[PDB]
Each structure stands twice: as structure tokens, then as C-alpha cells.
Amino acid sequence: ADLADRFAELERRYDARLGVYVPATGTTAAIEYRADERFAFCSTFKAPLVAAVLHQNPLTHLDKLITYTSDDIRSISPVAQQHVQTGMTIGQLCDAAIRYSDGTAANLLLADLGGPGGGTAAFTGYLRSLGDTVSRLDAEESELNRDPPGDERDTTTPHAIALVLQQLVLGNALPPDKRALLTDWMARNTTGAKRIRAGFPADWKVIDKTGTGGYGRANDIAVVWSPTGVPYVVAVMSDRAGGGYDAEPREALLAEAATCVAGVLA
């Protein structure tokens, strides 16, 4: 059989474009479907963003209090908009940016990295340092990404983001103490239950970071561990460019793609 045929059937059933990459391992072949096509990051960048902040600072930095105002609340910010009067530490911002996909938290972390484009250049440079020549972040988050499909800004590929996540969570891009923080925040994400997690059996561990936007955009990037403790990186991206800027994102597409992947890996 050919797994690519089954992904193609998902595209036709959901009226969508689907991108998948699972890196090869010591025991398995790579899974790749539109893996070198660009898809919007949406909030999936927030996981490597936290890595960038961890990489460039001692862990004492997580205690630094960041203050901000109600006028700094941009895009969907479930945590930050409750803490305007207190502020939030860098560690709390990392937590919110991953686990609640918090936009303001991410924008404050980008500012913490520094420089032109409100930290977006610095973030892209971090990805370049991990061997990613493809991905780019170009703007702070002011809304969920509903920019036209033709705009390359704020895009990655399943292949590129998967290999970034591989190095961050499973490789040696971060020292163990920093790696643990990233892993735990993704492990306790609150936004991903209906995506990759929904396609893997309950005895597999799943850690993830979602993204969702206009033009039917729905993404999930994950690391999964089998019931015997073998890890795999799974990146699934999707959009519906022909359905208009307000095309509905389909979490179920990601869940079914992940089920297809689990069938290969189990």
C-alpha cells in the first residue's frame, strides 16, 4: 500500500492541503507528504521561541518580571490579559505562550530576544543556527494569521519545523535542564487534545504545540513516545486556501492524519 494515497484521500475528503513530516529514526523510515511545501506557522513558532529564550539566558532569567499594559494585549492572550496589573515573569510567559498559545506572552518573549521587527529577526536567526534555512518569522502577532496564502512571511515547512523540534526536544540543542522545561510545557499543553493527541492511542505520550488561523489553517507539532518509550517527532500542517480567508480549520483532519501516522509507527 502507499500512505501517500491515504493522505491524498484526506485532502479530498476535507477539501484541504495537508503537510506531514516524521523524521526517520534508528528503527523507522521518514514519513513525508508535501513536507517541503510552505505552510503558515500560526502559533507553532511559540515552541522554538521559548527554546530561543532558554538558549540565550541563564535559567535565573525565568524569574525576571515583565510589566506591560492593557494596550499591549494583542491577539488571543488567555493568561496575559489577566495579569496586566501584576506583570508576568519570563518563565510564566514561556508557560503561557506554549500551554495557552498566548499571543501577548509570545510578543513579550520576542521583545526579550531583542532587535529589529520586535524580536522576529532574532528568532529567525535562532532557527538559522539550528540549520533551518527555510523558516521565517516576520511580524509580531496582532491576530491569528489570516494573511493570503501567497505571502511567504511567517512560514515554515513540515520538514523544517520537524527537524527543529527534533533537535530541541530529543537532540542536544539545549542542555538537559533547559530541555526539560520546554518538554514539560509542551507535555502539559491545553490546546491540542483534538489534534495529534486524538490520533494516537492513550498509552502513547504526546507533547505538542498548536497553531490555527485563517484560510482554514490548522497545525500541530508534536513529540510522541510509544508505550515502550520510543520517541518520534510528528509535524502536521494544513490549510484550505480555496475556501476563502474564513475557511473553517479542521482539527479532525490533523487527528486523522495522526491516526494514519500512528498506524505506521505502532
Residue numbers in the entry: 28 to 83, 86 to 145, 145A, 145B, 145C, 145D, 146 to 238, 240 to 252, ...
Provide the authors' original text about this structure:
BlaC is a class A serine β‐lactamase found in Mycobacterium tuberculosis (Wang et al., 2006). The enzymes in this class utilize an active site serine (Ser70) to perform a nucleophilic attack on β‐lactam rings, forming a covalent acyl‐enzyme intermediate that is subsequently hydrolyzed (Fisher & Mobashery, 2009; Strynadka et al., 1992). BlaC can efficiently hydrolyze penicillin antibiotics but has low activity against later‐generation oxyimino‐cephalosporins, such as ceftazidime, due to their bulky C7β aminothiazole‐oxyimino side chain (Sun et al., 2023; Wang et al., 2006). We analyzed the structural changes in mutants of the β‐lactamase BlaC from Mycobacterium tuberculosis obtained via directed evolution for increased ceftazidime hydrolysis activity.
In a screen for BlaC mutants with improved ceftazidime resistance in an Escherichia coli expression system at three temperatures (23, 30, and 37°C), the BlaC variant P167S/D240G (PD) was found at 30°C, exhibiting a 16‐fold increased resistance for ceftazidime as compared to the wild‐type (WT). The crystal structures of BlaC variants PD, PDDS, and PDDSH were solved at 1.3, 1.6, and 1.4 Å resolution, respectively. For BlaC PD, the Ω‐loop exhibits a large conformational change compared to WT, resulting in a significant expansion of the active site cavity (yellow), in line with the changes observed for BlaC P167S (green), which were attributed to the cis‐to‐trans change in the peptide bond between residues 166 and 167 (Sun et al., 2023). The parent variant for evolution, PD, showed a melting temperature (T m) of 52.8°C, a decrease of 9.2°C compared to WT BlaC (62°C) (van Alen et al., 2023). The yield of soluble protein of variant PD was reduced relative to that of WT BlaC. In the P167S and PD variants, peak doubling is observed for many amides, indicating that a large part of the protein populates two states. For one branch of the directed evolution experiment, we managed to obtain crystal structures of the successive mutants, PD, PDDS, and PDDSH, showing the opening and increasing disorder of the Ω‐loop in an otherwise defined protein structure, suggesting minor structural changes.
